[PDB]
Amino acid sequence: PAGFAEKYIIESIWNGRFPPGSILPAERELSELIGVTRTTLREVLQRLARDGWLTIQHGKPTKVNQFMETSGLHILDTLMTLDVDNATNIVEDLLAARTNISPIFMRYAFKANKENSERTIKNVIESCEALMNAASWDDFIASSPYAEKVLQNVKEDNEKDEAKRQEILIAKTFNFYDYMLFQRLAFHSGNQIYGLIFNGLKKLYDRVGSYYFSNPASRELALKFYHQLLETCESGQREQLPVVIRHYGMESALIWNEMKKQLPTNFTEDD
Amino acid sequence: PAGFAEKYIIESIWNGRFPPGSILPAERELSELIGVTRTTLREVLQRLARDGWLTIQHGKPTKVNQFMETSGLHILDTLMTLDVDNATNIVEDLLAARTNISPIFMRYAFKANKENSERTIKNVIESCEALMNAASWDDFIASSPYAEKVLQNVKEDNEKDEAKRQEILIAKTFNFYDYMLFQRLAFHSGNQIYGLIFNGLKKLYDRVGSYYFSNPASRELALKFYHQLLETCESGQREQLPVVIRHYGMESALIWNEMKKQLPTNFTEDD
Ligand code: NI
Ligand code: NI
Numbered sequence: 001p002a003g004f005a006e007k008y009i010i011e012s013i014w015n016g017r018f019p020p021g022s023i024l025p026a027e028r029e030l031s032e033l034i035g036v037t038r039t040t041l042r043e044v045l046q047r048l049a050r051d052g053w054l055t056i057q058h059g060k061p062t063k064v065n066q067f068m069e070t071s072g073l074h075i076l077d078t079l080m081t082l083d084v085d086n087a088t089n090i091v092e093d094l095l096a097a098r099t100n101i102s103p104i105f106m107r108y109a110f111k112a113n114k115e116n117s118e119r120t121i122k123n124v125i126e127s128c129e130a131l132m133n134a135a136s137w138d139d140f141i142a143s144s145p146y147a148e149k150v151l152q153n154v155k156e157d158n159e160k161d162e163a164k165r166q167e168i169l170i171a172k173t174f175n176f177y178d179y180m181l182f183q184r185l186a187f188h189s190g191n192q193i194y195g196l197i198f199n200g201l202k203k204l205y206d207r208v209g210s211y212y213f214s215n216p217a218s219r220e221l222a223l224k225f226y227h228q229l230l231e232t233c234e235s236g237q238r239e240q241l242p243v244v245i246r247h248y249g250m251e252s253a254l255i256w257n258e259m260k261k262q263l264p265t266n267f268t269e270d271d
Numbered sequence: 272p273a274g275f276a277e278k279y280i281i282e283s284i285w286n287g288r289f290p291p292g293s294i295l296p297a298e299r300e301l302s303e304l305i306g307v308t309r310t311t312l313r314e315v316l317q318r319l320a321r322d323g324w325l326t327i328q329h330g331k332p333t334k335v336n337q338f339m340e341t342s343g344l345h346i347l348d349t350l351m352t353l354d355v356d357n358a359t360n361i362v363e364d365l366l367a368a369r370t371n372i373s374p375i376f377m378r379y380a381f382k383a384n385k386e387n388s389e390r391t392i393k394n395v396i397e398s399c400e401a402l403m404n405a406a407s408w409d410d411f412i413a414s415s416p417y418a419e420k421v422l423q424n425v426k427e428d429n430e431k432d433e434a435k436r437q438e439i440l441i442a443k444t445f446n447f448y449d450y451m452l453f454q455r456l457a458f459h460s461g462n463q464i465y466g467l468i469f470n471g472l473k474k475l476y477d478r479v480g481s482y483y484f485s486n487p488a489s490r491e492l493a494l495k496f497y498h499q500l501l502e503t504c505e506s507g508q509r510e511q512l513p514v515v516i517r518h519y520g521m522e523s524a525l526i527w528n529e530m531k532k533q534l535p536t537n538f539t540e541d542d
Binding site: 002039040043044047052055057068069070071072073074075076090093094096097100101104152187191192193194195196197199200201202 | 273310311314315318323326328339340341342343344345346347361364365367368371372375423458462463464465466467468470471472473
């Protein structure tokens with residue numbers, strides 16, 4: 001469908017066919033270039049510029065935008081699918097950014113939204129511990145109030161190898177609750193921009209977590225981290241919050257630094 | 272054009288016509304509801320869900336997404352155009368977030384990209400001082416290497432009142448360089464996520480600055496701030512960076528807190 005057009009124009013800016021300083025060709029020459037309907041080319045080439053790839057103003061032609069000068073956070077996940085060997089750098093940026101800003105929005109959340117923060121952390125802890133103790137993923141999800149949302153986000157029930165299907169589904173479900181924790185606390189901070197940051201980063205977040213949380217050590221470390229966050233909020237021990245986060249940022253990074261050596265085949269996937 | 276459709280569906284989620292928990296009606300019933308072509312309804316109602324307003328999966332219907340659960344930073348500027356009396360809260364979120372994360376990405380930029388940071392700040396300072404000393408805005412822009420980009424971003428040469436045209440253009444140009452400073456330093460941090468944060472916030476940023484920087488005190492305060500940032504980077508006095516930023520975050524906020532009382536008519540505008 002239109003995905004052929006969008007992914008073609010996007011990929012042809014990454015392989016030097018239409019560099020970020022070049023002009024994009026005519027309307028009809030592009031609609032003719034790889035065989036796309038006129039009006040669909042109009043209405044997805046327009047929205048390929050709303051993502052920050054292009055700049056189209058009336059009269060003057062359409063011009064390819066510079067690298068990362070206009071695009072938002074979404075671009076990162078797109079850049080994961082192109083050129084495998086910069087994905088690691090993107091993941092370092094994600095982990096480092098989350099570790100950097102978590103003490104701010106979490107101290108705000110613990111101060112102004114103590115009870116809501118505690119309820120969120122308790123829900124995440126209970127769901128993660130129920131999933132880790134379940135006999136299978138189908139058993140946890142059959143009895144989970146988050147079943148439908150998880151199924152929206154954990155769309156993988158297609159693998160024919162049932163054991164690896166189990167591992168992948170456990171990882172994606174745990175990542176569902178990890179994201180829920182960070183994003184919801186970000187909104188609990190009282191500043192919507194932090195939550196919106198995670199919202200913009202969600203696709204990259206889930207791609208990273210679907211592999212990262214396939215390691216049992218990652219899940220146990222995250223679980224200890226959640227319990228520590230809950231204890232910090234409940235006790236009002238403010239000075240403990242940056243230390244906890246700091247430690248968790250380090251150790252998790254180390255785990256990633258090892259798992260990075262064996263990235264799965266699918267990890268850099270065009271959707 | 273399609274803007275009628277997109278702004279109608281978006282506005283009808285804000286005035287309780289299709290609440291964030293309701294279902295959206297049929298394809299043909301909506302394409303018939305306010306008179307939009309079938310396929311254009313398909314291809315902008317689809318992309319009104321890529322902005323996070325809807326969720327459309329095959330077989331199951333399209334469902335209105337919850338308030339701010341999926342949408343990215345862009346949503347903020349959209350929310351400025353709806354319901355005037357929450358715009359102030361959005362601006363508080365923006366100023367507070369920038370003040371919060373600026374010490375992090377600026378200390379990173381000063382440490383790992385000292386020379387690039389200094390070049391960026393010097394360019395911003397020189398452009399701002401040249402604009403503030405110019406006999407008119409047309410004189411500054413006629414002799415500015417940033418002329419075309421500014422004209423892309425400072426599209427206002429339509430006002431018939433020339434004096435107020437001058438004030439508005441000076442404000443928008445100064446905001447052009449203020450944004451350039453914060454965003455470019457954010458990218459200089461070495462973590463692309465900070466720069467991408469500003470990129471996602473750019474529309475709200477420019478809307479806010481086009482009024483905020485119409486006050487001469489705002490421009491002078493920002494200029495002193497830029498000089499202080501340059502001195503901090505050049506001297507390697509790390510401990511001064513959070514203090515400087517902190518002070519600037521306070522005073523600017525105070526200025527906004529006063530100017531907030533007389534928001535211009537256009538401030539909450541549907542494009
Ligand atoms: Ni707030
Ligand atoms: Ni980096």
